[PDB]
Amino acid sequence: FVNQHLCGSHLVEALYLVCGERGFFYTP
Amino acid sequence: GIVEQCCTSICSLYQLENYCN
Ligand SMILES: O=[N+]([O-])c1cccc(O)c1
Ligand SMILES: [Zn+2]
């Protein structure tokens, strides 16, 4: 739970950088 | 899921791009 939440924060930042202007979607 | 494939195993920049719009 806590481990999954901490990873999600970094995943969400990484997606923001890779996708750029196209944007992205995050659903846990 | 994003979590299923990248919180258990490491993900390349190409793998994450599949989750872009
Ligand atoms: O473990 N990963 O797959 C992961 C998490 C956060 C950022 C990233 O580039 C890769
Ligand atoms: Zn952290």
Coordinates of N, CA, C and O and ligand atoms in Angstrom, one line a residue:
Chain A
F1 N 0.8 -1.2 0.0 CA 0.0 0.0 0.0 C 0.9 1.3 0.0 O 0.8 2.1 -0.9
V2 N 1.6 1.4 1.1 CA 2.6 2.6 1.1 C 3.6 2.5 0.1 O 4.0 3.5 -0.6
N3 N 4.2 1.3 -0.1 CA 5.2 1.1 -1.2 C 4.6 1.4 -2.5 O 5.3 2.0 -3.4
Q4 N 3.4 1.0 -2.8 CA 2.7 1.2 -4.1 C 2.5 2.7 -4.2 O 2.5 3.2 -5.4
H5 N 2.1 3.4 -3.2 CA 1.9 4.9 -3.3 C 3.2 5.7 -3.6 O 3.1 6.6 -4.4
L6 N 4.3 5.3 -2.9 CA 5.5 6.0 -3.2 C 6.0 5.8 -4.6 O 6.5 6.8 -5.2
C7 N 5.9 4.6 -5.1 CA 6.2 4.4 -6.5 C 5.4 5.2 -7.5 O 5.8 5.7 -8.5
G8 N 4.1 5.2 -7.2 CA 3.1 6.0 -8.0 C 3.5 7.5 -8.2 O 3.4 8.0 -9.3
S9 N 4.0 8.1 -7.1 CA 4.4 9.5 -7.2 C 5.6 9.6 -8.2 O 5.6 10.6 -9.0
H10 N 6.6 8.7 -8.2 CA 7.7 8.8 -9.2 C 7.2 8.5 -10.6 O 7.7 9.1 -11.5
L11 N 6.4 7.4 -10.7 CA 5.9 7.1 -12.0 C 5.1 8.2 -12.6 O 5.3 8.5 -13.8
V12 N 4.3 8.9 -11.8 CA 3.5 10.0 -12.3 C 4.4 11.2 -12.8 O 4.1 11.8 -13.8
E13 N 5.5 11.4 -12.1 CA 6.5 12.4 -12.5 C 7.2 12.0 -13.8 O 7.4 12.8 -14.7
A14 N 7.6 10.7 -13.9 CA 8.3 10.2 -15.1 C 7.4 10.3 -16.3 O 7.8 10.8 -17.4
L15 N 6.2 9.8 -16.2 CA 5.2 10.0 -17.3 C 5.1 11.4 -17.8 O 5.0 11.7 -19.0
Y16 N 5.1 12.4 -16.8 CA 5.0 13.8 -17.2 C 6.1 14.2 -18.1 O 5.9 15.0 -19.0
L17 N 7.3 13.7 -17.8 CA 8.5 14.1 -18.6 C 8.5 13.4 -20.0 O 8.8 14.1 -21.0
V18 N 8.2 12.1 -20.0 CA 8.3 11.4 -21.3 C 7.2 11.8 -22.3 O 7.5 12.1 -23.4
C19 N 6.0 11.9 -21.8 CA 4.9 12.2 -22.7 C 4.9 13.7 -23.2 O 4.5 13.9 -24.4
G20 N 5.4 14.6 -22.4 CA 5.5 16.0 -22.9 C 4.1 16.6 -23.2 O 3.2 16.5 -22.4
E21 N 4.0 17.2 -24.4 CA 2.8 17.9 -24.7 C 1.6 17.0 -24.9 O 0.4 17.3 -24.8
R22 N 1.9 15.7 -25.3 CA 0.8 14.8 -25.6 C 0.0 14.4 -24.3 O -1.2 14.1 -24.4
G23 N 0.6 14.6 -23.2 CA 0.0 14.2 -21.9 C -0.1 12.7 -21.7 O 0.5 11.9 -22.5
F24 N -0.8 12.3 -20.6 CA -0.8 10.9 -20.2 C -2.0 10.7 -19.3 O -2.8 11.6 -19.0
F25 N -2.1 9.4 -18.9 CA -3.2 8.9 -18.1 C -2.6 8.0 -17.0 O -1.8 7.2 -17.3
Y26 N -3.1 8.2 -15.8 CA -2.7 7.4 -14.6 C -3.9 6.8 -13.9 O -4.7 7.6 -13.4
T27 N -4.0 5.5 -13.9 CA -5.1 4.8 -13.1 C -4.4 3.7 -12.3 O -3.9 2.7 -12.9
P28 N -4.4 3.8 -11.0 CA -3.9 2.7 -10.2 C -4.9 1.6 -9.9 O -4.8 0.5 -10.6
Chain B
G1 N -1.5 -3.0 -15.9 CA -1.4 -1.7 -15.3 C -0.1 -1.1 -15.2 O 0.9 -1.8 -15.2
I2 N 0.0 0.3 -15.1 CA 1.3 1.0 -14.9 C 2.0 0.5 -13.7 O 3.2 0.1 -13.8
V3 N 1.3 0.4 -12.6 CA 1.9 -0.1 -11.3 C 2.3 -1.6 -11.5 O 3.4 -1.9 -11.0
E4 N 1.5 -2.4 -12.1 CA 1.8 -3.8 -12.2 C 3.2 -4.1 -12.9 O 3.9 -5.0 -12.6
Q5 N 3.5 -3.2 -13.9 CA 4.6 -3.5 -14.8 C 5.8 -2.6 -14.4 O 7.0 -2.9 -14.8
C6 N 5.7 -1.5 -13.7 CA 6.8 -0.6 -13.4 C 7.0 -0.3 -11.9 O 8.1 0.2 -11.6
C7 N 6.1 -0.7 -11.0 CA 6.5 -0.7 -9.6 C 7.0 -2.0 -9.1 O 7.7 -2.1 -8.1
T8 N 6.9 -3.1 -9.9 CA 7.5 -4.4 -9.6 C 8.8 -4.6 -10.3 O 9.8 -5.1 -9.8
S9 N 8.9 -4.2 -11.6 CA 10.1 -4.3 -12.4 C 10.4 -2.9 -13.0 O 9.6 -2.0 -13.1
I10 N 11.7 -2.7 -13.4 CA 12.1 -1.5 -13.9 C 11.6 -1.2 -15.3 O 11.3 -2.2 -16.0
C11 N 11.4 0.0 -15.6 CA 10.8 0.4 -16.9 C 11.7 1.3 -17.7 O 12.2 2.3 -17.1
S12 N 11.8 1.0 -19.0 CA 12.5 1.9 -19.8 C 11.7 3.1 -20.2 O 10.5 3.1 -20.0
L13 N 12.3 4.1 -20.8 CA 11.6 5.3 -21.2 C 10.6 4.9 -22.3 O 9.6 5.6 -22.5
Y14 N 11.0 4.0 -23.2 CA 10.1 3.5 -24.2 C 8.9 2.8 -23.6 O 7.8 3.0 -24.2
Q15 N 9.0 2.0 -22.6 CA 7.9 1.3 -22.0 C 6.9 2.3 -21.4 O 5.7 2.1 -21.5
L16 N 7.4 3.4 -20.8 CA 6.5 4.4 -20.2 C 5.7 5.1 -21.2 O 4.6 5.6 -21.0
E17 N 6.4 5.3 -22.4 CA 5.7 6.1 -23.5 C 4.4 5.4 -24.0 O 3.5 6.1 -24.5
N18 N 4.3 4.1 -23.8 CA 3.1 3.4 -24.2 C 1.9 3.9 -23.4 O 0.7 3.7 -23.8
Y19 N 2.1 4.6 -22.2 CA 1.1 5.2 -21.4 C 0.8 6.6 -21.7 O 0.0 7.3 -21.0
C20 N 1.4 7.2 -22.8 CA 1.1 8.5 -23.2 C -0.1 8.6 -24.0 O -0.7 7.6 -24.4
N21 N -0.6 9.8 -24.3 CA -1.8 10.1 -25.1 C -1.3 10.3 -26.6 O -0.6 9.4 -27.1
Ligands
LIG1 O1 10.5 1.4 -11.6 N1 10.1 2.0 -12.6 O2 9.6 1.4 -13.6 C1 10.1 3.4 -12.7 C2 9.6 4.2 -11.7 C3 9.6 5.5 -11.8 C4 10.3 6.1 -12.9 C5 10.8 5.4 -13.9 O3 11.4 6.0 -14.9 C6 10.8 4.0 -13.8
ZN2 ZN 10.2 8.9 -3.1

